[model samples]
Target chain A: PEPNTVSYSQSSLIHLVGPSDCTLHGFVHGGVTMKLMDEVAGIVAARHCKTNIVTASVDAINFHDKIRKGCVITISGRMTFTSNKSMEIEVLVDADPVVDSSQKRYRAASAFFTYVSLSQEGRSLPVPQLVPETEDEKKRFEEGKGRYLQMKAKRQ
Target chain B: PEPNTVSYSQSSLIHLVGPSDCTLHGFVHGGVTMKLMDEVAGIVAARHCKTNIVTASVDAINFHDKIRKGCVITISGRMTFTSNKSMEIEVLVDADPVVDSSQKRYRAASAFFTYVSLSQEGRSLPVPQLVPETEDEKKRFEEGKGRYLQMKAKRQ
Candidate 1:
């Protein structure tokens, strides 16, 4: 049977960083970025499936740069692939420099989050297949498969 | 030369969970948990070195249970090991259910965070060594070493 495919993704920009979101060093806390990333991913996953979903795991987030308070952060996420009961979403955060500088907006952090769609009773539910259309989407889908294998192997 | 050893760790219990921290399903946003975890890890890393430090990367977090808004959370962190300019800190989160129940506090999530010490100018700086005190600390240090190697291999 040819499986039906769908697409899901979203992005948001925030100038909402505050002193409370920062560390004693005055730089935005990494947790703030992580919180934003997970929110973005959760939105993407929730939109893809109508049922309740829970974050099963989140892969490594490499911070290429530090974001100071007041820096504009653009957080985006896209569903990469879906399995019988789970899906992987790619989340990216780009930070605009805080101080006036010549540097362009840089990729601040990136991560993959695995979320499981659940029924009312909390049991996992099958999700719709995601069809990758563009080249980038196809690449992400492939890489997501690799991550799935690695995670399974590690858990064994 | 016998390298100098440093120790830094902290724990916090938050009774504060807001509506903004919950999802449409009313579960606490995983991002909030991630943020709190990162905050705890960052403090441990910063206390170890009085210089600038940024989250280099965070190891995967496998969430054992879902947390809802108003659930009391306990987040804690401790140094695992240190390399030349980076160190790994293990962060753990446990949640106490909101309504009265006979359940004990259970693990909600766990992860390892890698932080790089930086100079005032934002360049990476070597950090002091860490001497594991307990058998559990020694085990975490060994595991952190393995993660460091895996990260290096993946980047290469």
Candidate 2:
């Protein structure tokens, strides 16, 4: 099988914030954004591995700004790094005001999701290698490698 | 104003896994569990501060085990630490198989959610102090404080 490139698995989703998605304060719930982030990241990992996958862990997620009701959110995800059995997908959320087109879009949140490929019987499966095609992708791959090593050390 | 005990704001939710909550592999989606964790954490923070609150950041979340379809999940959250403008809530998810009444429940995931109390006008509001009444609570408070300081320093 051919090795996968970062662009081959990149994915994104656009969501319209509704009433039920917001808190009483009229700002979107952090959970709503988190769920969307997970979904997009899952897609990215699945596209890369083409095997059953599950989220193993999520790195720290930061909400830089609150998304208000009636705003539009764009979530994007892409493969950043991979190990023998795990892959890290970087997810980003950006929000834009629906009513005012002149308002600039801003980053709402960002996180890195780690996923492990699994067989049908739930055993860990080795994933194909990832090829970073660009300088940015290479940079992210190195950073992800550092995080993966740090997390691995902490687990021991 | 009365200081809030950890138990005063502790909250949980029990959810029955349904078809819609699972991935194509019949396991619960990580996002589903994450959303539930965030909701419970939000409730705990809101109960303590009695003011509008927003999730500022989430610590690394680990998924220890997979929850299959037809399992029941119990998500619990409670205050662990509080700064002048932020409160840390520890959230845990436990899963039990619905078909096997004799099976023991197992931990599915855990994370720490940090929230900021907010006024109606969206400005930061001070939260009430948290009083740990038990030895376990006190230990958790200290650990949470350490994590908080570590994260704060990393941000700087």
Candidate 3:
């Protein structure tokens, strides 16, 4: 069995930051973060397969912490497995307070995404095979697959 | 009659935004907004149709305007009225900042989302027919259908 390779990607928490994006006390909304997770997840999935893939679903996004205004977020994504045209991508999100030149890590989120390679007619297309390369990578793949089946069963 | 376009029940804004949302930098992140669009689009499709749906594609989002960070946003969705479960949902995000006894009018995001209904076993689903209730509503239905096809064929 080959190890899954981890990929690194990042998004500057830099955003227009709107009012509807906040909590009652004035913080970025949780759903807003989920949106960010999806973007990062899709990015990693596309890169891994090098094809135009669409999201089948976001299996999970466990918000470990929060990000306030004065903060810049950094992210990294890794791929665990590929079943023909479908790629399972995981995103690890981290946030940092923007006080100075460097961002201070304050929050983190881990999420899973499902992407299927698409043809011009919007159908399933072939993609590259994903390889897991580390113990942690293997662990993520296992967990991601487990959760994928779990969430999938709940959908009607 | 135009084909493709589905409509969902009028759920409260809370379904898209959360109960504990906060105010951030004034406008929300592009990524976060996209997630909401994708989500409601799927939910609306599921509410009105019975097909296994998947996102076939999406174009790059252009943030022509900024959304207020801590205001109410109104999202409306309609599945494209056709045997095709391809849905065309539009968001009329409006923001009114109410804090510190001050009122602020913030720009909202007008976004479009495409959803395809799915089945329990993961296959394409069929959608129900939609009857327009008003003249304005009928115009919107026609406009959204045009956008649905155009977006699917976008060169980018």
Best by DockQ: 3
lDDT string, candidate 1, A58-153, tens digits? 988889888876778889888887777788988888888676888888888899899998889878888867888889878878888899989999
Off by over 4 Å in 3: A1-4, A8-24, A100-104, A148-156, B1-156
Single out the weakest 10-residue window by summed lDDT for candidate 3 chain A.
Answer: A1-10
Error of 3 at B52 (Å): 29
Q: Predict model 3's lDDT versus the native.
A: 0.60
Candidate 3 structure quality by residue, lDDT tens digits, A63-108 = 8877666555666566766666577876677776655755456556
Model 1: per-residue Cα lDDT at residue B96:
84
For model 2, residues A1-156, the per-residue Cα lDDT tens digits are 357999899999999998768654577778889999999999999999999999999999999999988898999999999988899999999998988667799999999999999999999988888899889999999999999999999999
Give the whole-model CA lDDT for all candidates, comma-separated: 0.79, 0.91, 0.60
* Better-scoring candidate (TM-score), 1 or 2: 2
Task: Let me know the DockQ for model 1.
Answer: 0.03
Q: What iRMS does model 3 reach?
A: 7.2
Tens-place lDDT digits, model 2, residues B1-84: 235998788899998776667787979889999999999999999999988999999998999999987788999999998988
Q: Each predicted complex: what DockQ?
A: 0.03, 0.02, 0.08
- Model 3 alpha-carbon miss at residue B117, Å: 30
lDDT by residue for model 3 (B1-156), tens: 333233234332533343333235454666766666666666665565545556655444446566554455655545433325565555544555544447665445555556666678877665566656667678877886777667657755
